[PDB]
Design a protein around this ligand. Structure first.
Ligand code: ZN
Length: 29
């Protein structure tokens, strides 16, 4: 019911967190 990093399947209260979180998963900005 809340964004979830399909990568580490991490859920956050904010989207930015996810996005920014991904930054690590890769390097796409
Ligand atoms: Zn993740």
């Amino acid at each position: 019911r809340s964004f979830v990093c399909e990568v580490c399947t991490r859920a956050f209260a904010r989207q930015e967190h996810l996005k920014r979180h991904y930054r690590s998963h890769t390097n796409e900005k």
